[PDB]
Amino acid sequence: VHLTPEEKSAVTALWGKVNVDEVGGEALGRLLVVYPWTQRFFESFGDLSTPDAVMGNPKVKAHGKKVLGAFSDGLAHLDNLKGTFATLSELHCDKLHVDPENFRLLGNVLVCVLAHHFGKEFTPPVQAAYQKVVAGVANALAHKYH
């Protein structure tokens, strides 16, 4: 992503108050709960029956960790997202075959959750910047199902 620098800063500074141990679960959990067909990928995690099930799923928890952790890396290399989600894309497009649209989804639910934590602080202009970040990452794990 482009991002102006006032954008460059808002994404960041905000991203700096994120308990990653925490958001990456919310996000990976909400997804499983909101867009249910996504579950087939994580049959292995176990009981995803209810939201509370999903939410209380430590596996769900530990994984969202992994995801956001990738986000921060990506978030760090806006300039060249492709380098970063290198192996990432291979995995999703290739070994797993996950429709890119989903990636798109994981992103929006990760905006939705930032809005939840930071309330007013998450501003329209702020959302705007993140929205840019999200598209980038998406496209970056995508352009491997070409």
């Binding site: 939201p51 959750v113 809005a115 959302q127």
Partner: protein
């Protein structure tokens, strides 16, 4: 689909919204013009700038509607026959744009309901706006 449960939280959450409905319908509109500029193309006869009064006006209109739909959440097809015609036939809004607005409405709700935007409610709200969107574009059928 609006499971009973689904209807509960829609009411519980919308009810929570109350009179802020204007604000939020304006916040939501605003969120959309910025994150997705492509949508701005349908409001040429408007000032889309921040302070903007024209948008506020329209935001209340949206909020109101969401409202009358939440009411007759049970029969939104009749509850929206007008707007439906207007969006489909008059405006010929691309159906893609609905998904972008719902998202920026979601993101407004969540912004203003921390104790209340649970992964269950997040879900129900998500389903109903889609319900809404379906109707609003059913004439494309």
């Amino acid at each position: 689909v609006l499971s009973p449960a689904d209807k509960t939280n829609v009411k519980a959450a919308w009810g929570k919204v109350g009179a802020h409905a204007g604000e939020y319908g304006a916040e939501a509109l605003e969120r959309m013009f910025l994150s997705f500029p492509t949508t701005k193309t349908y409001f040429p006869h408007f000032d889309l700038s921040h302070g903007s009064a024209q948008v506020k006006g329209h935001g209340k209109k949206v909020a109101d509607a969401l409202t009358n739909a939440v009411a007759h959440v049970d029969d939104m097809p009749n509850a929206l026959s007008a707007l439906s015609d207007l969006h489909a036939h008059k405006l010929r809004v691309d159906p893609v744009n609905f998904k972008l607005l719902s998202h920026c409405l979601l993101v407004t709700l969540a912004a203003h309901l921390p104790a209340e935007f649970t992964p269950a409610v997040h879900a129900s709200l998500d389903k109903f706006l889609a319900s809404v969107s379906t109707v609003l574009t059913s004439k494309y059928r």
